[PDB]
Design a binder for this molecule. Structure first.
Ligand SMILES: *SC[C@H](N)C(=O)N[C@H]1[C@@H](O[C@@H](CC(=O)O)C(=O)O)O[C@H](CO)[C@@H](O)[C@@H]1O
Ligand SMILES: *SC[C@H](N)C(=O)N[C@H]1[C@@H](O[C@@H](CC(=O)O)C(=O)O)O[C@H](CO)[C@@H](O)[C@@H]1O
Lengths: 138, 138
């Protein structure tokens, strides 16, 4: 589980995502974003099939789309509990994992819960992310 | 699908795996391995939950175990059909994807079919790979 979680985290950090692993790191990051920037958050997970769908879609769209988020960050639900709880204070939605959140400044503009990922074709998940970035990112 | 497949391939090539994407590349690689070396093959896939389980387990064990394969390579079933068919000529097993193969020289010593991956905890998949490398790799 140790090496597995680091690989699942590495899938994101090897492709531009900043890993926020303490409550303090989340507060320091989210309370310092510029009001006009967009921040894409992947809430990672180790278990089930949904987690394996969420990582590739997020990496592919957030790094290749024309309209891309200013910032890409991740918290790891289950593994980094305090970081995940603090991020969820900014999101203010029903908690689930994996899940996606998109911010403009500190305001949530898009949220995808676990139930919209589970059992969904990876190409369709990527398409929703493309739509959300196109509507909200410069 | 284009960007998605490259991310799923990149998960392996960003962590030491050689991507073999033509029939010629597979023949040239497998027909040139040393008789005493071990070659771990990940047959990648874009679809279903099994594919998302197979990648992290393979990366974590093949790069972190004490006993590690000499060579790590991958063919992408569906995406690179000719490469996958040629690799399957060396494997000589029922075809499935995702699947794992381990060679000593050109002789198959371990095989894991899709049906042993689908619905399996990722930690248990990693454990079988650890056992197979421990038994067969220096
Ligand atoms: S996948 C099996 C897993 N133990 C689980 O039940 N996950 C659910 C759980 O996730 C939490 C982290 C964890 O892996 O335990 C979390 O998100 O904090 O709870 C959420 C919310 O109910 C579910 O979406 C997960 O499936
Ligand atoms: S996951 C849905 C997919 N279309 C599929 O049916 N995969 C099966 C298929 O895989 C081939 C590549 C592909 O994605 O089409 C392949 O491995 O060459 O066939 C194999 C063998 O029967 C199955 O193990 C896959 O689930």
């Amino acid at each position: 589980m140790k090496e597995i979680a680091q690989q699942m985290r590495g899938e994101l950090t090897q492709n531009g995502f900043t890993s926020l692993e303490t409550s303090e790191a989340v507060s320091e990051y989210m309370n310092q974003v510029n009001a006009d920037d967009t921040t894409f958050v992947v809430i990672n997970s180790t278990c089930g099939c949904a987690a394996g769908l969420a990582r590739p879609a997020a990496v592919a769209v957030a790094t290749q789309n024309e309209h891309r988020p200013t910032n890409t960050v991740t918290v790891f639900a289950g593994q980094d509990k305090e970081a995940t709880a603090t991020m969820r204070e900014f999101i203010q939605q029903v908690p689930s994992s994996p899940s996606y959140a998109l911010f403009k400044g500190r305001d949530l503009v898009y949220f995808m819960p676990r139930e919209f990922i589970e059992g969904r074709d990876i190409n369709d998940i990527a398409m929703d992310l493309k739509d959300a970035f196109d509507e909200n990112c410069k």
